[PDB]
Design a protein around this ligand. Sequence first.
Ligand SMILES: COc1ccc([C@H]2[C@H](O)[C@H](O)[C@H](C)N2C)cc1
Length: 438
Amino acid sequence: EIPLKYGATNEGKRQDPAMQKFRDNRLGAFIHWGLYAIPGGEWNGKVYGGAAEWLKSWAKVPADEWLKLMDQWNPTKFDAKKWAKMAKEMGTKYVKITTKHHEGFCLWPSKYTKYTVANTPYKRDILGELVKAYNDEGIDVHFYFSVMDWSNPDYRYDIKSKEDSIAFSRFLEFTDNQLKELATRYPTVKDFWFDGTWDASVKKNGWWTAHAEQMLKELVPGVAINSRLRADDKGKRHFDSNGRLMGDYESGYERRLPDPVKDLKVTQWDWEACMTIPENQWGYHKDWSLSYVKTPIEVIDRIVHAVSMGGNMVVNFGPQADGDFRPEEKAMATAIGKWMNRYGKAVYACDYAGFEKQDWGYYTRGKNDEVYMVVFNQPYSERLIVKTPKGITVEKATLLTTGEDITVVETTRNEYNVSVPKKNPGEPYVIQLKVRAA
Ligand SMILES: COc1ccc([C@H]2[C@H](O)[C@H](O)[C@H](C)N2C)cc1
């Protein structure tokens, strides 16, 4: 036991209604929208293959020159009602929005910097319009926020001097001011998801990370705060020096997921994964031929995978400079939405089922002990193997869409074959099991 002032304080999962809502939501969208949408991965005739939102770094653009992109910020097709409708039709229950990425441009009219939507031709408070539009559709809003800020020259990557320590304190005060502004201007915010907290400077200032968490919780009753924010007294991130989770949920799975057989430890805490559609583009990149682009089924598979292991999934979108979405993202959202409309009872408010993993897909568990079999890989044998835990029996199987009864045959002591449906559903599909415990 290492004594710590800025280590974990939550033991186990929060169970207040606000955390239950965060969890039950299950499926979210991410919006990465910032000045990077304008060049879209390309600078002075060179298309950089790295993540578009990091182009300032790939092309070594000075801050002042990068931020001049504000003079081109005029997303005339932006319509916050349409964005919220796209999200609603996709079946997302929440949206995480980049309020400020590393570049330092604010999507709200901050009074603490001039690098904001207010000082662009478009002028309008994008963040505020989205908050209202999403909330009107019954969709929760979470705020992404980059502590690392390339526009503020008081930022430091490490503290090598008295002068660095003083500048960095001032940077942290600046940061607090913007955070307070976000929390008070948009009081329906449900979560703050921090990024840009990996540098030695932040790791040396764990206390500030604890403070930011407490400060926002005081301002916003029930707000969630991601693990990525947090560093303890020693500079240990996400989990403290005693191995305890800091913040309200674990937030490292990014472009990867826990192993359904080997990583069952994740079921012990809330957690949230985020993913990109291409391999590694968050902001709008104009050229998606450069890497593998996931299909809707691949995305759905990840969504179900996360829920099957007690986690949320958040699918990223990188809106165009003009304020519309690219055709690939419209198609994706529509395809996810159609699936979720049919099969979402197995996703929303579901969780880990406690069954041994089978090859046909995933199990999820509903609030009233429903066990859903979500089938992604159809056996030529036409039999879906179900091995139940000790004391559990399967009493019925039903095809979710139609209510048709599905034959269940006991094959051994703890195992059944659940038949595939008489007609191949032609897409990943759900069989709902009624189970009984001794
Ligand atoms: C490996 O270092 C990284 C990778 C991704 C990021 C950023 C991406 O730009 C995106 O916002 C992702 C969610 N974030 C962690 C930051 C540092």
